[PDB]
Structure 1
Amino acid sequence: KRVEKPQLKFKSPIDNSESHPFIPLLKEKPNALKPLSESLRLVDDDPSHYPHPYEYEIDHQEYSPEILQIREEIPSKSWDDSVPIWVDTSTELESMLEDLKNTKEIAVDLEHHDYRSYYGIVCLMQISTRERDYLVDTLKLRENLHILNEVFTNPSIVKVFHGAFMNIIWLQRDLGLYVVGLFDTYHASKAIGLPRHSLAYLLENFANFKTSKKYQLADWRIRPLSKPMTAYARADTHFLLNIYDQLRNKLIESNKLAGVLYESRNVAKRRFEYSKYRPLTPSSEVYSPIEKESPWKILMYQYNIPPEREVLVRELYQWRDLIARRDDESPRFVMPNQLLAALVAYTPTDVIGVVSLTNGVTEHVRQNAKLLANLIRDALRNIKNT
C-alpha cells in the first residue's frame, strides 16, 4: 500500500542542509535550576555548538527518595483490564499530561523510522504509568509534544527506559524533549550481571512475554496501526515499571544502584548534533550521524572492483547523499550500496544500461539514469585519458 510522507504535513519543514549546529527546539524550561537563556548560549570551537539545555539539571538535581528505598514489586496490570490509550489530538495529549503529573514513575519508549527520511523521524511514543499504557502519535503531535518536559524533566518522577542511548537523541531532535530522572534498565541489567541485556530477554523472563522478531523493522508511519503493532508497541512499556522495581531492589541490595544512576545520567546528557559539527575526539557523550572512514573502500574490495575506480565510487556516494538530503530519503532508498556496487562493477554508459541492470534499479536511479550514465562515462573517459 502507498504511504504518503508525513513530513509533508510537518509545521516546521525539514532542513537537511546542516548550515548551522543543531539548535534545541526548546522554548520553555520547566523544573529549571538555571535560566533557559543561560542554557541557550552558543559555544565556541575547541566545534561550535549549543550545549544541553538541561545539563546542569541532570548533574545537580536530586533523585526522588522512593528510588532509593527497597520497595515491594508492583506487578504490571493485567493486559486485558485495559486498552492502550491512543493519543493524537491536542486535547488527549493534554489530558495525558495531567495523568503523568500524578505519577512517581513512568515507562517510556519510542519507535523510529529511517528508510523514508534522511535523519529519521519519530513515529510513535509509548508511555506507561502503573495504571495505564499510552500510545502517542508523534507524527501528528510533533509540534505539541514539548509540554511533556513538565513531567520528563521533573526529577521527582522516574522515567524508565530500556536502552535510552538513541531515544534520548531522537527526543531532542524531533520533539524538543529532555529527560531528568532517568533510570535505564539496560544499565541496570548490566550492573546486575544478567546473561542477556535485551528488552526481549527481560520481557520473556520477568514478564513471560514472547516478542516476535522483526516488528521494529515494520513501517510505523502507517495509520492506523495494525493490531499486532499496537500490541507490540504497548508491550514495550506495559511491563517495564515492574522490571524497574525488581532491578532497582537488587541494585539496592547489591551495592550497585549508585553506579546505574550515574550511567543513566550519562545517557540522559547525550546531545543531538549534526555530523558536520561532530566532536573532534570520540565520545559516548555525543552522537552524530556520520563519523568514520570512507565506506567505499569496503565496497570495492567486497565486489572486487578494479582499483582505479575510487573516484567513481566516491562520486556515487556524494550524489546519493546529496539527493537523499534533497528529497529527505535514506541513502538506501535512493540507491542501496549493492546497486551502487552494480553500477561501478558494470559501468553502464547509457540510460538503457543503467535501468536494465541485473539488480534492477530504484526509483531514484530510473529518474536520474542519464545523469548516472554521464557520471560513469566521464569516469571511463577520464580513466583512459587520465
Structure 2
Amino acid sequence: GMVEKPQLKFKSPIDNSESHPFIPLLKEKPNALKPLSESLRLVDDDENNPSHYPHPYEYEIDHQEYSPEILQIREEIPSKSWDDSVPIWVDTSTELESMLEDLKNTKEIAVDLEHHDYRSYYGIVCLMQISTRERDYLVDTLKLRENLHILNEVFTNPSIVKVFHGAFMDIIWLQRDLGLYVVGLFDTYHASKAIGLPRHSLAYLLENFANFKTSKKYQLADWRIRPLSKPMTAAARADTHFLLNIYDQLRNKLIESNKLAGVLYESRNVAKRRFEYSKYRPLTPSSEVYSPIEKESPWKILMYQYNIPPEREVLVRELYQWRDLIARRDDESPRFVMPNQLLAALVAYTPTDVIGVVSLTNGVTEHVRQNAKLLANLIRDALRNIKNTN
C-alpha cells in the first residue's frame, strides 16, 4: 500500500549533493575500440560547457561498423504467439546470467524501460523489458541495479541490433542508473518519421502493425511495486514483444527508399546523448546533453501567475530553493515535497503560524506539515522585510 522506498535497499547510497559532474558508473568496457583509460578523464571548462566527463562509448558509436544484415532487405519474422510463452521474470544474478548467455546468441533484441520520479529526486529505473525473436524478458532493475552492468557485453556489441522506440530518455536513464550504454541502436521513432507515417508513437505502430490497442493507463502507474500486477506485467511485455517485427518492416521500407543511413545516423546520435547534473549543464541547451528539467512552475516567480503580487517574488524564490534542498535531502521529487499549487497557496495567503500553514484551505503535504514552523518563520520574515525596506 505505502510501498517502501526501494532506494533504502540499494548497495550504493544515492547522492543528490551534486558536488561534481556526473561520473560514469562503468568499470569494465567490452567491445572497446578505445581503452577505458582515455575514457574516464575530464573536459575542462569552456564557454560552451564547463568541466565534465565524456560519453565512454562515443568513439565506438562513431567507428563500430554495423552488422551487414541490417543493410539487407530480409524476410520479416512474425512476433511469437503471445499465448505460446510467459514473460520471463529476472531478479536474480543467476537468472540474469542465463538471460545474458541467451542474448549473446541473437542478431537483434528489442528493449524498453519503465521509470519512476515521484518518490525520488533524479528518478529511478524500475523495470527493463527485453525481447528476442523467441521470448520476452522482464528485468527487475531495482533489485539488480548494481549487477545489470554486465549487459554492456551485448548492449555495446555492434553485431547485435538493439531496437528501441524513442530512446532519447532511455539512453539517459541507462547510464545514470545502470552504467549501461548502447552501440548498434535502431530507433523506430526516427524510422517512422523518415518513412512519413501519419503518427510516430509506439501505440500507433502497435495498433497498425500488430493489432494491439494500448492503454495510457500505466504511464502514470507506480512501477516500484512488487510483485507486478497482471495488467502491468502485460503492458510492459507489450512494449518489446512486437517490436522486432515492426523493426523488420520499417528497416525494409527504409532500405527500399534509401533512407536507412539517415535513420542510423539519427540513432547513433540518440545513443551518444550524455547525462549531466543541471549544475554542470552546458550553457546553450542542446539535444546532445540531458540535464534534469523542472516538471513544474517556471524557476522562481511562475507564469501560472496565481496573481502573484510584486513584492512577493523573494518569498516565492526562497520557497523554491527550500523545496529543492529538502527534495534533494530526503531524495524525493519537488512535487511530493510541495506541489506548486501549494507553494502558490502559501504565497497567496502567507500564513504566519503553524495553524495557518497546516489548515491551508488547499490541504497540505507531509513535508509542509513537518516543517510548518520553519515555513511560518520563512514567510513571516518575508513579510517583515516588505513592511521594512519600503
Query: Secondary structure of the residue that 1:296 maps to in structure 2?
Result: coil
Retained in 2: the 8 A contact 1:299–1:341?
Answer: no
Counterpart-to-counterpart distance in 2, 1:8 and 1:303 = 37
> 1:86-114: CA deviations, max 9, x gaps?
00000000000000000000000000100
- Cα shift readout 1:115-150 (whole Å, capped 9, x = no counterpart): 000000000000000000000000000000000000
Question: Structure 1 residue 338 and structure 2 residue 341: aligned?
Answer: yes
The secondary structure found in structure 2 opposite 1:123 is strand
| Structure 1 SS opposite 2:303 | helix
CA-CA distance at 1:36 after TM superposition: 0.5
- Take 2:303 and 2:93, find their aligned partners in 1: how far apart are those partners? 51
Partner SS, residue 304 of structure 2: helix
- Pick the aligned partner of 1:256 from 246, 255, 259: 259
Range with greater deviation from structure 2 (28-37 or 280-289): 280-289
Give the deviation of 1:339 after TM superposition. 0.4
- Which consecutive aligned stretches of 4+ in structure 1 deviate over 2 angstroms post-superposition? 290-294, 296-302
Distance 2:245 2:85 in 1: 17
- After TM superposition, give the deviation of residue 333 of structure 1 in Å: 0.1
Shift of 1:299: 2.9
For the Cα contact (< 8 Å) 2:23–2:53, is it kept in 1? yes
Any unmatched runs of 5+ in structure 1? Answer: none
Q: How far apart, in 2, do the equivalents of 1:296 and 1:38 lie?
A: 38
- What corresponds to 2:153 in structure 1? 150
Determine if the alignment matches structure 1 residue 116 to structure 2 residue 114: no
Cα 1:160–1:171 shift into 2, 3 Å: same
Q: Is the Cα contact below 8 Å between 2:218 and 2:232 reproduced in 1?
A: yes
TM-score scaled to structure 1, two decimals? 0.98
Shift of 1:292: 11
Cα offset for 1:294? 8.1
Task: Answer yes or no: is the 8 Å Cα contact 2:115–2:127 preserved in 1.
Answer: yes
Q: Which residue is equivalent to 2:83?
A: 80
How far apart in 1 are the matches of 2:80 and 2:201?
22
Counterparts of 2:325 and 2:343 in 1: how far apart (Å)?
A: 15
SS of 1:298 mapped into structure 2 = coil
1:147-204 alpha-carbon deviations (Å, 9 max, x no partner)? 0000000000000000000000000000000000000000000000011100010011
SS in 1 for 2:335: helix
Contact 1:324 1:330 in 2 (8 A): yes
Deviations along 1:42-81, one digit per CA (max 9) or x if unpaired, are 1111110111100000000000011100011111000000
SS at the partner of 2:166? coil
For the structure 1 residues 365 and 138, does the alpha-carbon distance in structure 2 shift closer, same or farther, using more than 3 Å as the test? Answer: same
SS of 2:168's partner is coil
Distance 2:294 2:169 in 1: 16
Instruction: For residue 298 of structure 1, report the CA deviation from its aligned partner.
Output: 5.8
Paired-residue identity, %: 99
* Kept after mapping to 1: 8 A contact 2:33/2:60: yes
- CA contact under 8 A between 1:300 and 1:341: conserved in structure 2? no
Instruction: Note the aligned Cα RMSD (angstroms).
Output: 1.3
Q: Select between 209-218 and 174-183 the one with higher mean Cα deviation.
A: 209-218
Would the aligned equivalents of 2:154 and 2:160 in 1 still touch at CA under 8 Å? yes
Aligned counterparts of 2:128 and 2:296: Cα–Cα separation in 1:
34
Does the 8 A contact of 1:275 with 1:291 survive in 2?
Answer: no
1:293 Cα deviation (Å)? 12
On the 8 A contact 2:34/2:59 being kept in 1, the answer is: yes
How far the C-alpha of 1:296 sits from its partner, in A, is 4.8
Q: In the TM superposition, what is the alpha-carbon distance from 1:214 to its structure 2 partner?
A: 2.3
Shift of 1:283: 1.3
The answer to whether the 8 Å contact 1:296/1:313 transfers is no
Work out the number of aligned pairs and report it.
384
The more displaced of 225-234 and 302-311 is 302-311
Contact residue 87 and residue 135 of structure 2 kept, 8 A: yes
- Given that 1:118 and 1:330 are in contact with CA atoms closer than 8 Å, whether structure 2 keeps it comes out as yes
Could you tell me how far 1:41 is from its partner in structure 2?
1.4
Alignment CA distance shift 1:225-1:294 (3 Å): closer
Per the alignment, in what secondary structure is the counterpart of residue 45 of structure 2?
Answer: coil
Change (3 A) 1:57 1:369: same
The corresponding residue for 1:18 is 18
Whether the 8 Å contact between 1:168 and 1:179 is mirrored in structure 2 is yes
Unaligned runs of 5+ in 2: none
- What TM-score comes out, normalization by structure 2 length? 0.97
Q: Is contact 2:301–2:316 with CA below 8 Å preserved after alignment?
A: no
For 1:327 and 1:172, how far apart are their aligned partners in 2?
A: 23
| CA distance in structure 1 between the aligned counterparts of 2:102 and 2:92, rounded to whole angstroms | 16
Asked if the contact 2:36/2:56 (under 8 Å) is kept, the reply is yes
Match in the other structure for 2:242: 239
Q: Distance in 2 between matches of 1:291 and 1:121?
A: 16
Cα deviations by residue, 1:277-320 (Å, 9 ceiling, x for unpaired): 00122211001114899815663652002111110000000000
Counterpart contact for 1:296–1:310, Cα < 8 Å: no
